[PDB]
Amino acid sequence: DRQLRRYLAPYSAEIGVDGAEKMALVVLLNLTLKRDRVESLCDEGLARQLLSDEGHITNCLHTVRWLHTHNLKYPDARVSGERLIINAPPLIPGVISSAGLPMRMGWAHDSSDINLAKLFGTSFRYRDDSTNLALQLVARSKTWEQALIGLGLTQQQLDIWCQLLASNLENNTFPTVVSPFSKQVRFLYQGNYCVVTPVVSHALLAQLQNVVHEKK
RNA sequence: CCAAGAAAAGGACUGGAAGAAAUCAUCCAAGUUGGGGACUAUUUUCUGCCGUAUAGGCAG
């Protein structure tokens, strides 16, 4: 059912997977293929086969390096450079912003990672909080690791991935230089001028897509 | 020191043909508008002559 793909989409409400970690790994791995090649996201065999392909998974692990909280390319695909990962600013009583929302990440690098990026960057509700596959494996979450080894992964392959997967989330969180296609505007601040560059919040935009259709 | 600064959407056209809304049908009954009254006020046009003359022309 297409409704499963809808509920796992970035513009839909998050769904719980507690006690279903085995089928969650199967569905999430199966999403890495083009829709024309998959008759069902529930086939354990296809998942066990995809998991054994270190190259396919390696190509998927590589997408983690560009997961972000704020998207510097949103209005204009020409912007080139590094990702941006920042905790939401303190709440201002008179302003609507990401300050009142929980932590979420998205993906945007070369435009050919639409399917391969879905294995680690797809979020879900777990232990009654918002998480994703990359975070549970980096944090050494045993329930997910036990299901993943059960689906055919060698302990030695997992012991190596925990390290490479974690490493991809440990650096390049702030751009080195201002990119040549970004916006720059200047105003007075504390008696002198400062240049401001705006950026769109992933969590805030994704929520708006749901609220306008539900609240009319 | 205005989500900063610059930007040519342009070219060509053929919707045409035919046509039958008809038949009948009844607005009636009575009715009471009605009593009073200053347009002349501080206003100008008055007096002689020619002429058969309330015609028609002139001096003050």
Query: Which residues lie below 8 Å from residue A130, measured CB to CB, with a gap of 6+?
Result: A14, A102, A103, A104, A123
Q: Give the position of tokens 């839909």.
A: A12
Written in H, E and C, the secondary structure of chain A is CHHHHHHCCCCCCCCECCCCHHHHHHHHHHCCCCHHHCCCCCCHHHHHHHHCCHHHHHHHHHHHHHEECEECCCCCCCCCCCCECCCCCCCCCCCCCHHHCCCCCEECCCCCCCCCCHHHHCEEEECCEEEEHHHHHHCCCHHHHHHHHHCCCCHHHHHHHHHHHHHCCCCCCCCCCCCCCCCCEEEEECCEEEEECCCEEHHHHHHHHHHHHHCC
Rounded distance between C-alpha atoms, residue A154 and residue A52, angstroms: 9
Phi, psi of A118 (to 5 degrees): -65, -25
Q: Which bases of strand B have any atom within 7 Å of the beta carbon of a protein residue?
A: 1-4
Give me the CA A49–C1' B54 separation in Å, rounded: 145
A71 and A202 in contact (C-beta within 8 Å)?
Answer: yes
Give me the CA A35–C1' B28 separation in Å, rounded: 87
Give me the CA A109–C1' B17 separation in Å, rounded: 63
User: How do A123-126 and A129-132 pair as beta strands?
Assistant: antiparallel
Amino acid code (one letter) for A154: T
Q: Which residues pair with A155 in a beta bridge?
A: none
- Among A60, A24, A58, A31, CA closest to A144: A24
Q: Residue A81 burial by CB count (10 A; 0-12/13-18/19+): exposed, middle or buried?
A: middle
A69 and A105 in contact (C-beta within 8 Å)?
Answer: yes
Phi, psi of A68 (to 5 degrees): -145, 165
Phi-psi group of A43: left, alpha or beta (phi > 0 → left; psi -120 to 50 → alpha; rest → beta) = beta
A26 and A41 in contact (C-beta within 8 Å)?
Answer: yes
Rounded distance between C-alpha atoms, residue A112 and residue A62, angstroms: 12
Q: Residue A57 burial by CB count (10 A; 0-12/13-18/19+): exposed, middle or buried?
A: buried
Phi, psi of A196 (to 5 degrees): -115, 130
A172 and A65 in contact (C-beta within 8 Å)?
Answer: yes
A102 and A130 in contact (C-beta within 8 Å)?
Answer: yes
CA distances from A148 to A11, A22, A42, A118 (A): 27, 7, 15, 17
> Dihedral angle at the C-alpha atoms of A66, A70, A72, A76, nearest 10 degrees?
100
Q: Which residues pair with A189 in a beta bridge?
A: A192
Rounded distance between C-alpha atoms, residue A49 and residue A181, angstroms: 43
Rounded distance between C-alpha atoms, residue A112 and residue A66, angstroms: 13
Whose CB is within 7 A of strand B?
A 75, 183-188, 193, 198-200
Give me the CA A134–C1' B48 separation in Å, rounded: 140
Query: Which residues lie below 8 Å from residue A198, measured CB to CB, with a gap of 6+?
Result: A183
